[PDB]
Amino acid sequence: PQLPEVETIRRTLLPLIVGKTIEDVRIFWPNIIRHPRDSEAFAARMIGQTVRGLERRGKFLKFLLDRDALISHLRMEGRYAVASALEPLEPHTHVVFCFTDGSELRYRDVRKAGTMHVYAKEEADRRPPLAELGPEPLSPAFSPAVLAERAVKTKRSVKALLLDCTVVAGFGNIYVDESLFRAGILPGRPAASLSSKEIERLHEEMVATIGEAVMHLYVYGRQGNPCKRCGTPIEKTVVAGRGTHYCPRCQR
DNA sequence: AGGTAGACTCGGAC
DNA sequence: GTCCGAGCTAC
Length: 252
Ligand SMILES: [Zn+2]
Description:
Largest sheet: 5 strands, mixed
Number of strands: 11
CATH superfamily of the largest domain: MutM-like, N-terminal
Protein name: Formamidopyrimidine-DNA glycosylase
Domain Formamidopyrimidine-DNA glycosylase catalytic: 1-114
Distance between the termini: 30 Å
Shape: elongated
Bound molecules: zinc ion
Radius of gyration: 20 Å
Strand order of the largest sheet: 2-9-5-4-3
Binding site for Zn(2+): 227, 230, 247, 250
Structural class: alpha+beta
CATH architecture of the largest domain: Alpha-Beta Barrel
CATH class of the largest domain: Alpha Beta
Organism: Geobacillus stearothermophilus (Bacillus stearothermophilus)
Number of helices: 7
Subunit structure: Monomer.
Strand content: 15-25%
Order of helices and strands: HEEHEEEEEEEHHHHHEE
C-alpha cells in the first residue's frame, strides 16, 4: 500500500479496534517482528493492553496502546483485517492480535515483507523505524525551502532525493515518477541542478499528486504508450534502483 | 565525518 | 534467472 491507502487503512481500521483489549498475540512468521527481536517478548508485552489510537507516519501505521506503540509497515502486499476468532484465518496470516471480545486484528502478507516494532509510546518517535523519517508530504513541514536545502547539498539525482525517506515521508516510486512528470522535470536530473522555480513546481506537484490520491497515471507503468499530454511514447529506465518512467518531451 | 551505494528481506510473474 | 518496491553495513 502507498501512503494514501495507508491513510485509508488508518481511518477505517481505527473504529474497528479502538477500546479493544489484547488477550493474546499469535505469531506464525517471527521475522516480521523486528523489536523486541524475540517474538515471545513482543507477544508477552502487548497482552493486557487496550488499543487507544491509530496514527500514520509516512507509510507506517502507529497503533497506540496503553503503554506501548506498535509500529507497522505493510510493505507492498501487507493487509490488516478485523474478524472473528471462530472463523478460519486467511492464507498467509503471519500475526494475529486476539482481543477479549473474541475478535482479532490479523496481519496477512503473501510476501512476508512487513515489519513490526513495539516500544514504549514515548520512545517510538526516536527509535527505528520512525527515527529520521522526514516530514509528511502534506504538512507545512514539507516546504519548497526544505526541499531546496536537501537538493543543493546532494550530488544524487532528483529521483533519488524524493525516494529518500529522510527527505519526505512515504513518497513511493509511483508518486515520484508521476510528480516529476507533472512538474516537467527529468528523474535523472541532478537534484542540485533544479532551479528555484523547478523546486517550487516539484513541491507543488508532489503535494497535488499525493493530495489528490488521499482525497489516472501519466507515466508510471505506461512505457511504450503515448504521453497523455503530448503523445510522445513514454520511456522506461532504471534510476536509483527503481523502474523509472518519463516523457522525454514533457520532462526536461 | 558522514554521504552514498549495496546488500538484504520476500514471492509471484516474465 | 530477473523484474518488481521499502527502508543496516562498509566504502
Ligand atoms: Zn509528454
